[PDB]
Design a protein around this ligand. Structure first.
Ligand SMILES: O=C(O)CCc1c[nH]c2ccccc12
Ligand SMILES: O=C(O)CCc1c[nH]c2ccccc12
Lengths: 140, 140
């Protein structure tokens, strides 16, 4: 059957199944999916643009802006002007947001280790390498 | 940074970027994303359950049921009773739906070939193999 080997379908199914496993943990720790994606994407990062955040969190930019309105109100993130461009807003995690998400990030790493363990280090690194190359070739 | 190598984030970004490329083609041919996923998942398939269709199309089951209401009204799919279980509904593509989607499926195969060409046959097959194994290990 067409769908059994069609790459976009395989990527989307694998992504949904693994992510839905971790979302149960995230919600048990008081996070929504979008809050978790934003804080995990910003943790240990320099400030990035709203558009970059939208791409890496796979969230539409108007949705991200509304999310940042409330996460900034809760002191978990901060928006800042671009040092040069008046049309670009940067965003960073605050210390409060980092402390809020650090434990969950450790649980995320453990869950990822469990997902990748049956494949071995070689196949795991090959998968991550291929995905990174694909993203860098298709990002706008 | 955590997010740069986190497998669920890599899978979701790669999936979104590649799929969004093909969705432009699908809509130019008059398909919505959900209609394309249903018809492509059913093409060349025996009847499958609603729950199976929801999993492979990564669409919530109530959403799939509403979608099938209108696709069945347009004669593109047919729901049928399970030969044994009264609690299971099966669904299939009709000849009309297959003829509607066949050309688009060829374009999908060409787009996939372009996406995978830089990686080579070995890395492409390794990726598809790993994704299939991951789905089969995490599907409920
Ligand atoms: O490209 C998409 O629309 C998402 C990938 C995808 C998930 N399930 C699918 C079933 C058939 C064709 C494509 C898909
Ligand atoms: O697990 C998810 O919520 C989807 C995967 C995902 C996409 N972008 C992300 C950014 C940070 C952490 C996880 C993700």
């Amino acid at each position: 059957r067409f769908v059994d080997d069609y790459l976009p379908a395989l990527l989307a199914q694998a992504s949904q199944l693994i992510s839905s496993e971790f979302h149960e943990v995230a919600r048990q720790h008081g996070f929504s999916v979008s809050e978790w994606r934003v804080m995990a994407s910003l943790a240990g990062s320099e400030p990035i643009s709203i558009g970059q955040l939208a791409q890496v969190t796979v969230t539409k930019q108007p949705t991200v802006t509304r999310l940042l309105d409330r996460m900034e109100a809760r002191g978990q993130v901060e928006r800042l002007p671009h040092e040069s461009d008046r049309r670009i807003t940067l965003v960073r995690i605050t210390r409060k947001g980092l402390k809020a998400v650090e434990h969950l990030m450790e649980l995320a790493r453990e869950h990822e280790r469990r997902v990748l363990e049956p494949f071995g280090l070689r196949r795991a690194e090959e998968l991550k390498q291929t995905l990174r190359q694909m993203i860098d070739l298709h990002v706008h």
